[PDB]
Amino acid sequence: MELTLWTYEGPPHIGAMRIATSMKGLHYVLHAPQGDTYADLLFTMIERRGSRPPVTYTTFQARDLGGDTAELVKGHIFEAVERFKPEALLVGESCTAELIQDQPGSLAKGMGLNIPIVSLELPAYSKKENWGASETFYQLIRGLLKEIQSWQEEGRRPRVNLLGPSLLGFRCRDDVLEIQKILGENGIDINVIAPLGASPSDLMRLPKADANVCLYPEIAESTCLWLERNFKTPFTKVVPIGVKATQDFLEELYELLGMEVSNSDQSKLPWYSKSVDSNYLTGKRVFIFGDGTHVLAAARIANEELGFEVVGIGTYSREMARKVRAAATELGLEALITNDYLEVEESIKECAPELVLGTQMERHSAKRLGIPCAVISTPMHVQDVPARYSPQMGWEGANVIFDDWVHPLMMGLEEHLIGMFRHDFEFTDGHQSHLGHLIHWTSEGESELAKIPFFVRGKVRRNTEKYARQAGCREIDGETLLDAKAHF
Amino acid sequence: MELTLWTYEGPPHIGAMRIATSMKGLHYVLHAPQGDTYADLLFTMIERRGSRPPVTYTTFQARDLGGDTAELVKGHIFEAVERFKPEALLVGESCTAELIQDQPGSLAKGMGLNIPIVSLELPAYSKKENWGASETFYQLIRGLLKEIQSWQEEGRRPRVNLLGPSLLGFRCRDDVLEIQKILGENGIDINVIAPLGASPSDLMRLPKADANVCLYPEIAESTCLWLERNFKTPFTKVVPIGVKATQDFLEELYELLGMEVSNSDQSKLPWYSKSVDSNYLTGKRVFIFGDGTHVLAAARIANEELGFEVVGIGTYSREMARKVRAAATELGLEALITNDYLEVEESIKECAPELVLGTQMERHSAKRLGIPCAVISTPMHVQDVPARYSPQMGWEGANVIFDDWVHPLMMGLEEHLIGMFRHDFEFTDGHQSHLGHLIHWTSEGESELAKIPFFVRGKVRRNTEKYARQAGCREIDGETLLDAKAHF
Amino acid sequence: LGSPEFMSGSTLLKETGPREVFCGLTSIVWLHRRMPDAFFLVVGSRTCAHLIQSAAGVMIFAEPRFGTAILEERDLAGLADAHEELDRVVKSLLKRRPEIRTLFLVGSCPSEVIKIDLSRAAERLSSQFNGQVRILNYSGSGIETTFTQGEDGALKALVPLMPSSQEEQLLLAGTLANPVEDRLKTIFNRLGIQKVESFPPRESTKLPAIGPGTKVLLAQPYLTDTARELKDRGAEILQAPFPLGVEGSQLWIEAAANAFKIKKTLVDATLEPLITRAHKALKPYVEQLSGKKLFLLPESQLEIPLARFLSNECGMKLIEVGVPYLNREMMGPELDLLPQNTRIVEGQHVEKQLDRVREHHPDLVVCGMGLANPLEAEGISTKWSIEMVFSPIHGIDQASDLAELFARPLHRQNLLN
Amino acid sequence: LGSPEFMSGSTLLKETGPREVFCGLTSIVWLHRRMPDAFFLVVGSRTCAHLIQSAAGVMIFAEPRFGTAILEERDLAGLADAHEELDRVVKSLLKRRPEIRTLFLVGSCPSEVIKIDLSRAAERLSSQFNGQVRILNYSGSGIETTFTQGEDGALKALVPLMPSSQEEQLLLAGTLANPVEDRLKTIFNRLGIQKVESFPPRESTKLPAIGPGTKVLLAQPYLTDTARELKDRGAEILQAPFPLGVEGSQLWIEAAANAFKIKKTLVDATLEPLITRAHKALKPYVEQLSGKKLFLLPESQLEIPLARFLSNECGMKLIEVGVPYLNREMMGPELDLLPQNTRIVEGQHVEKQLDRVREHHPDLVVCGMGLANPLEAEGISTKWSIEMVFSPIHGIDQASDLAELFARPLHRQNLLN
Ligand code: PMR
Ligand code: PMR
Numbered sequence A, B: 001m002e003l004t005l006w007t008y009e010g011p012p013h014i015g016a017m018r019i020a021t022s023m024k025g026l027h028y029v030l031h032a033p034q035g036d037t038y039a040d041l042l043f044t045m046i047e048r049r050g051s052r053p054p055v056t057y058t059t060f061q062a063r064d065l066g067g068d069t070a071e072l073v074k075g076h077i078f079e080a081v082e083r084f085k086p087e088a089l090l091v092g093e094s095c096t097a098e099l100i101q102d103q104p105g106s107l108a109k110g111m112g113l114n115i116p117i118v119s120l121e122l123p124a125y126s127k128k129e130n131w132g133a134s135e136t137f138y139q140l141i142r143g144l145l146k147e148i149q150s151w152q153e154e155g156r157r158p159r160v161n162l163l164g165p166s167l168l169g170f171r172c173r174d175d176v177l178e179i180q181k182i183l184g185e186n187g188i189d190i191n192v193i194a195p196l197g198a199s200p201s202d203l204m205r206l207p208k209a210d211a212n213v214c215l216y217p218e219i220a221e222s223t224c225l226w227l228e229r230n231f232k233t234p235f236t237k238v239v240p241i242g243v244k245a246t247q248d249f250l251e252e253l254y255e256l257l258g259m260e261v262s263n264s265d266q267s268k269l270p271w272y273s274k275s276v277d278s279n280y281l282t283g284k285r286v287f288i289f290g291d292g293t294h295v296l297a298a299a300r301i302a303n304e305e306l307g308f309e310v311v312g313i314g315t316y317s318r319e320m321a322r323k324v325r326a327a328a329t330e331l332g333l334e335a336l337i338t339n340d341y342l343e344v345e346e347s348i349k350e351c352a353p354e355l356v357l358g359t360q361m362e363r364h365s366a367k368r369l370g371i372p373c374a375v376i377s378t379p380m381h382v383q384d385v386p387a388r389y390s391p392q393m394g395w396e397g398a399n400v401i402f403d404d405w406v407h408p409l410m411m412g413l414e415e416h417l418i419g420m421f422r423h424d425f426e427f428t429d430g431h432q433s434h435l436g437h438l439i440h441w442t443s444e445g446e447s448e449l450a451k452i453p454f455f456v457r458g459k460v461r462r463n464t465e466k467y468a469r470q471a472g473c474r475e476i477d478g479e480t481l482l483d484a485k486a487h488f
Numbered sequence C, D: 001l002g003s004p005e006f007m008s009g010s011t012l013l014k015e016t017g018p019r020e021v022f023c024g025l026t027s028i029v030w031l032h033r034r035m036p037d038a039f040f041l042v043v044g045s046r047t048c049a050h051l052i053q054s055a056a057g058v059m060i061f062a063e064p065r066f067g068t069a070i071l072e073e074r075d076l077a078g079l080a081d082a083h084e085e086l087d088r089v090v091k092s093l094l095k096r097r098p099e100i101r102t103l104f105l106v107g108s109c110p111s112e113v114i115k116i117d118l119s120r121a122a123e124r125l126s127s128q129f130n131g132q133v134r135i136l137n138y139s140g141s142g143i144e145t146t147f148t149q150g151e152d153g154a155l156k157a158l159v160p161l162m163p164s165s166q167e168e169q170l171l172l173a174g175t176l177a178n179p180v181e182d183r184l185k186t187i188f189n190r191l192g193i194q195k196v197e198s199f200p201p202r203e204s205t206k207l208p209a210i211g212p213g214t215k216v217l218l219a220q221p222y223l224t225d226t227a228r229e230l231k232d233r234g235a236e237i238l239q240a241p242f243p244l245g246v247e248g249s250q251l252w253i254e255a256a257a258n259a260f261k262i263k264k265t266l267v268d269a270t271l272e273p274l275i276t277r278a279h280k281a282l283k284p285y286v287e288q289l290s291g292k293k294l295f296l297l298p299e300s301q302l303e304i305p306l307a308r309f310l311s312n313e314c315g316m317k318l319i320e321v322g323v324p325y326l327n328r329e330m331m332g333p334e335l336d337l338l339p340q341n342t343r344i345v346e347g348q349h350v351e352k353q354l355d356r357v358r359e360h361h362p363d364l365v366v367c368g369m370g371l372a373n374p375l376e377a378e379g380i381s382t383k384w385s386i387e388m389v390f391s392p393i394h395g396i397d398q399a400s401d402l403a404e405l406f407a408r409p410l411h412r413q414n415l416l417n
C-alpha cells in the first residue's frame, strides 16, 4: 500500500476519458462501479462543459456481483452504440472492474458491431492518468491507420498537425490558439488538431501533414513516434513555453519543413524582465514541480528569462525523468522524481524557497510553509480553467507567465521598507498588502536571525546551522550568523 | 483648503502630459518647479516605457524667483524645439508656475517658431487630470483643423476613428486592440487612433473617417462634439464594456454607418455566468466607484450580466454625474458624487458590501474593512498595467472582467462549509484559502449575529438595528435579529 | 420501470439501469469539518484518491484531513500482508498528523470486493494505542453506499463507543449546521427538555452517552443502520417527519415534546411566534415557486422531504420524485404528508430518466453536477442537488432559507434574461 | 559648466539647467515608517498630493499615514483665512486618526511661494492640544529642497523638542535601518560607550536628550541644517567620513572612539574580526565590479561617499560624480578619501549630462527612475539611485550588501544574456 494524501495523477481511465471527451464521434463504454461517474464533474464543473461526456458507465452494485456482470457490460455496449451512434468505440475498465476481469474490450469485438473498436488495457494499479491518455490516443490512431518535400512541389503552404492538447490538460484551450496564430504568421497552416476537437475521421488525415507538432509529449509522444515510423512524418521536440523555447521551436519546425528564416520582442516578457523594477527579482529562490514538460519549460524561464535561482526541481512524470535530471544537473541540483506529496513538501521545506512554481498540490504545502505560490501544471482545479485568454505557450503565453509568476512575490517598495523598518502596526513581517489582507541558538543568535527580512530567513537559518556544523562551532550566536553569510 | 488623504485624479497638467506622451511628434514645455519631474515616473515605471516623455520642464528653484523666470521658460522653449524638432508644441504651467503667471503659452507664440503652438490654459486649482487631457486634446485638434454616405459611393469599407485611448488610461493598450479586432470582423476599418499612437499629421486625417468612436468620453467627448459640429462626423456614445454594451455599441455604429446586421456567445462570460457554479453569485452585494465610464459599464454588468445586487454606486467624474445618477435611480440608489476619499470609505462602511469594484484607492478602504476588492478604473498603479492581454472592452474584455471580479470572492464549497461549521482550526471565519494565506445588543442577540456567515454579517447588523429602531424595540435579542431577517 | 405499488395515496416505482450518484466516500467532504479532530483514511485505489481531492481539493489545506492508502500490485498479488501494510501506513500517517484523535479507515470498492478486513485492523490498531488514537472503520464503497449513506456508516461506527447511561436525554442524530444545532437546542430547552445532545458531536472524543431513557430524533432520512444500532443500545427511536420547512419541523419537534410529555399549551406558546414569522418570510419565495413544475433525480434520500416541503409550503407541482433508496418504514410519516398521486421512483436509469425530464421540460430540475450544466445548455433550469447537504436547512426558522435555495436559480434566470 | 575649482586633488564643477530630482516632500515615504506614530500632512496642491500617492500608494493602507491639505481658489484669493482653514482641516484629520502623536505640516512650493506661515500654525495648534498631539512644521518644497533634504528639514524641526541634558551620550543622526541601528549600538557598546541613541527615534514622542557632553556622529551626508541646530544646543558634531563600506565605517567608528578616548587596542580588537570577514564577503562583488566605469547623476548627496566606496573598495572607475548639493566642509573627510582627479559636478543640466553619459557609455549609470528604463532601452545598464535610501547600507558588516546593490544589475545583465 502507498499512503497518498494527494495524488498528482488520477487513475489511467481518466486519461482515456480525457481523450474520448476531447474528441467528437468517439464514445467510451466504461465498466465501473456505481459512483465512478464523479469523473463527469471533471468535465461539467472544472472544464465547465455544457454537454455530458461521451461515456457510458455500467455502474454495477454489490448485488450485481452475485449475477452476470459480463452480460451487464454487453447490454451497455449495445445501448451506447444504438443511442449515440459513434464513429468509433472505446471499451475499458476502471480499477474495481479490473479486479473482476470481465474482459469487456474483447467482448465488444465479438458483438458484431460495424464500427472500429479500441479495447483498452489500462493497469489501474500500475499506471496513471497521462499514461492512460497516451496509451488510448496511441491505440486509437494505430488502430485507425495500421493498414495504411511534397509541399514545395504541390505549391501549397506547409501544414502541420497539432498533437497533444486535451481537456483537463493545462491551458490547452489557449495554447492551441496561440500556437496556431503564430504558425499562420510564419506561413504555416494547420492540418489536424488532435485529440482536442478531432473526430476519428480527422485522425485519418494525420499522414497528410508535412510535420507533427508535439505540444504535449506526456499525451502525444508515443503517437508521434508511431506516426514517424509508419508514415515518415517528422515531429518537433521543443515545446514552445517561454520566449527562448518558442524561438527554438520555430527554428526546429522550419528545419523539418525546409524553410529559411521569430523575433524576441514579439513577447513583452523580455522588456518587463529587463526593466528596472525586475532588478530585485535577481536571485529569488524558487522551487519547481509538476509534469515533465511544464517543469522543463519553467526551469529555463526561471533561470534564463527571469533571473531566479532554482533551488529545487522535480517531476511526477517518471517517463520524463532523465530529461528533468539533465536539466537539474545543469542547475547544479539533484532532481526530485516522485509522486509522493510528502516528499515534495519535505523538499520544499528543506530548501526554503521564496517562490514555489508547482501544481495545485503545492499550494497545500506552500500555505502551510507560508511561501508565495503559483500553479504551472496539472493537477489543477477550476481556477486554472479561466474565461479569459490564458495560454502558457508562445509570445502571449510568456506574457501571462510573467504576470502570474511575479504576482505572488512581495512588491519592490514594500519589500525594501520591511527590510528597513520592522516596528510597524500595519506593515508587519510577512505582510503583503498588494494581496489586500490585514544545534542550539543563543538569544543573541536568534536576534540576528530575526533581522533577516522574512522569505529569505528560512535559507539563512539553514545555511547558518550548516555552517556551524561545518566548523568546530558549538551553539550559535549573532557573529556566526554573519560568518555563515560571508562564507556562502 | 480640502483635506485629501487620497486624490482620485492628478492635477490637470498630468492629463496634458498624457496626451503629449501618448502621441508622437508632439513636445510639451512645462513651466514647473524642480521636483515636478516625478511625473516622468508615471510613464517610465507605471507604463514601463523605454523612452523619456516628450516633456521639457523649466524646473525653477527658489533662487530663480529673484530672477527672470519668464526668460527661463523662453530659453527652454528654444532648446526644446531645436533639440527635439517636433511637429507641434504644447506650452503650459504647473500649479506653482500658475501662481507666478509668466504667461508661457502666449510667450511661445511670440518667439517666431514655425510650428503650430497650443497654449494650454489649465486651472490647476479648479480642474483635474481628465479635464486637462480632454482640454489639451480638444485645443490641439481645434487648432489643427480650424481653417478646414460617401463610403458606399467610393466602394470602400467603412472607416472609423478611435478617439480616447491614452497612456495612464485604464487598459487602453488592449481595449484598442480588442475593438479594432472586432470592427475588422464586422467589416469596419480603422482610420486614425488618437491620441494614443497618433501624430499631429495623423490628426489632420480625422475628418476622413465615416464615424468617430468615442471609447473614453472623459478624454474625447469634447473633441467628438467639436468634430461633429465642424465636419458633420457622427460619433458613438455607447462604450463597449460588457457583453450587452458591446452589442449595443455594434448596433449603434452600424446605424451611423448605415449597415444592416454581434452574437452573444462570442464572449465566454454569458456561459460562465449562466453555469451552475455562478448560482451563488446571485444577490451578492457590491459597491461600485471610479470614473463615469467604467462605473456605468460595471453597473450594467453587475446588475444584468452577473446577477449581483448593487448596494452602492458613485463616481468622481462630475461631468458624468447626471448619467451616474440616472443609473443609480434605476438601481434604486442615490449616487455618490464626490472626490472625497473619506466620503467613499464611509459609504462603503455603511452599506457593508460583499464586494467593492473601485479604484486603487478603494483597495485602501476595503483592506481596512476586510472586503474583497477588484480594480475597475483609474487611479491605478503598476499591477494594472500588466504584460498580458487585458482588455476591459469587447468580447474578451468581458472574459477578463468575469475572472477578475469573481476572483476576490470566497469560492462555493468553502463558503458553504464555513456556513455549516464554524469550529475549525484552519478554515476559520473570514478565511479564504484560495488566496493561500493562513442601540444595545444583548449577549443573546450577538450570539445570533455571530451565526451569520461573515461577509453578509455587516448588512445583517445594520438591518437589525434599523429594524429595532423602526419599531418600539429596545435593546436587541436573538429573536429580533430573526424578525429583522423576515422583515426585509 | 416495473409494476407500481401504492402507499399513502402515492405511487412507488422502481427502475434499474445506469446510475449517476456519488459513492459513500464523499461523506468525508462534510464529516471532516463537522469533526476536525478526526482523519479519514480511505483504503482503495487511485480512483478513490482522485475522487476526494477532486471534491475537496479546490480548497487549500495546510494540514491534511483525509487521504488514501492506495492498493499496489503486491497487495493484490498477496505478496504483502494487508494487515502489516495497513499498520505501517497508519504509522507514518500519525507521524505527519500526530494530533489525530480518531482515525476512520474507510472501505472502498477495491477493499470491499477483495474483502480486506478493515474492521479487525481498526480493532487491532485501536489496541496498539488506546490512550491516544481511536481507529474505526466504515464502508463508503460505491457498490454498497450512495452519497449520504456514507454518514450512516460513519455514525454507526461511533455508536459502540458511546458511553452507557440511563439518563434523560434527547438525541439529535444526523449532521446539523452549527447554528442550526444551537437553535434547535435553544428551542428544546424552552420546552423544558434540559438534556439535548447532537450525534455526531463537534469533537470525535466527546460522544454523547446512550441507553434507555434516551429519545432519538432523526434529523436526516439516511440513518437506517445508525438508528437500528442506536435502538440496539436501549434508546427509543421517535417516529416523525424530517425537520424541513414549517410543517416538517413542527411535527418533528412535537414528536419529542409528546415523548417527554410536555404540555401542549407550552409547545404552542413556544412555536407560535416562530411559525407566524416563518409564514411571513416564506411569502416572496412562494410567489416565485408556486405553480412551478419540479423534477428531482436520486441523490441523497432528501428528495421525499424536499418534495413534501416544496409542494405543501411553496406550492410547487411534483413531476417525479427520485430516490436512490427508500426505507418505507422510515419515510412513513413523510409519505403521509406528501400530496396524493405523487410519483416516486426508487433506483434509476439515467438515460430513460433524462428522457422523462426532456419530455416534460420541468421548470426546475434538481440534479447532480454531472447533469446540471448539460441540462442548462438544453434550456432546462436546474438546482444542483448537493447544496442541501451543505446548507442550514433544518428548523422552523430555516424554512425561508430552504425555499430560497430553489428560488435562487429561477431568480437568476430572470436577472440574466 | 563653469570654471573648475580644485579640492583634495579632486575637481569641483557646477552646472546649471534643467533638473531631474525629487522634491523634499518625498521624505515622507521613508519617514512615516521610521516613526509610525507620526502623520505627515502636506499643505500644497493636487500635484503634491499626486506625488506622494504615486510613490507610496502602490502599497495598500488600512490606515492613512499621510495626506494633503489642497489649496483651493478661495485660499489663493484670500477669501478664506488660511489659519482658520488649517485648524479645521487638522481638526477633521485627528477625527479619522485620533492616535496620531506627532503631526508634520509639510511645506510645499505653493505654500512657500505665497508664504503661508505654517510654523506659527504649528505652534498655535500645538498649544490647543499640548497633552496629546505635537504639531510641527518643515519645508519639503521643490524650490527649496531636493529629495533627502526633506529629512534634514524634519529632523531640524524635532531638535527644539529634544530634552535638555549634559549626560554622556553618543548620538547617531540620520535614518538607519532597524537592524543596522541595533548592530551599530551593539558595536559601540563593546567599545565601552554605554549611552548610544538614534535620531530620529522609532517613536516621535521619545526623542533623545541633548546638550554638552553629547557627541554626534552624522550617518547621513544631508543633515547640514540639523547638524547646525544640534550644535546650537551644546552638542559636539564629530567630523568623519560616512559609514559606507569598510573604510568609511571604520573611520566613522574611530571618530567616536577618539572623542570618548577609548584605547586603540580595544577598538582594534573589536573591529578586526568585523573587517576581516567583510573583506572576505566583498571579494565576489569586487570581481564583478572592478574595472567597471561608473557615472552617478545627482539625487541624494550620497553620491560622493558611494563613489568613494565603489572605487576604493570595489575598484570601479569614476567617470562623473554628480551631486544636487555640496556642503564642502561636511564632505571634507570624504573628499580626502576619494581617488585623485575625481570629477564632481554640483548641480545639473540633465540634457547635457545625458550627452556626457551617452558619449562615455558607462558600464553602470546610477540614475533616477525617470531615466533608468529609457537608458536601458539605449543599451546602457543602470542602477536606480533611490534604492540606497531604502537599503541597510551602513556599517562594516553591510559593506558586501552595499556592493551587491551595484553588482546586481550587472549580474542580471549577464543572466538574461
Ligand atoms: C511619484 C512618482 C513615482 C512612480 C510612478 C513610482 C513607481 C514605482 N516605484 Mg517608486 N515611484 C514613484 C516615486 C518614488 N518611489 C520611491 C521609492 C521606491 C522604491 C524603494 C521602489 C520603488 C519601486 C517602484 C516601482 C516598481 C514596482 C514595485 O515593485 O513597487 C514602480 C512602478 C520599486 C522598484 O522596483 O523600483 C525600481 C522599489 O523597490 N519606488 C520614492 C522614494 C521617496 C519616490 C518619490
Ligand atoms: C469529484 C468530482 C468533483 C468535481 C470535479 C467538483 C467540482 C466543483 N464543485 Mg464539488 N466537485 C466534485 C465533487 C463534490 N463536490 C461536492 C460539494 C460541492 C459544494 C457544496 C460546492 C461544490 C462546488 C464545485 C465547483 C464550483 C467552484 C467552487 O465554487 O468551488 C466545482 C468546479 C461549488 C459550486 O458552486 O457548485 C455548483 C459548491 O458550492 N462542490 C461533493 C459533496 C460530498 C462532492 C463529492
Ligand code: SF4
Residues within 6 Å of the ligand: A033, A034, A035, A036, A095, A096, C023, C024, C025, C044, C045, C047, C048, C049, C051, C107, C108, C109, C110, C140, C141, C142, C143
Ligand atoms: S469507492 Fe468505488 S465508486 Fe467510490 S471512488 Fe472508489 S472505486 Fe469509485
Ligand code: SF4
Residues within 6 Å of the ligand: B033, B034, B035, B036, B095, B096, D023, D024, D025, D044, D045, D047, D048, D049, D051, D107, D108, D109, D110, D140, D141, D142, D143
Ligand atoms: S512641493 Fe513643489 S515640486 Fe514637490 S510636488 Fe509640490 S509643486 Fe511639485
Ligand SMILES: [K+]
Residues within 6 Å of the ligand: A002, A339
Ligand atoms: K505511486
Ligand SMILES: [K+]
Residues within 6 Å of the ligand: B002, B339
Ligand atoms: K476637490
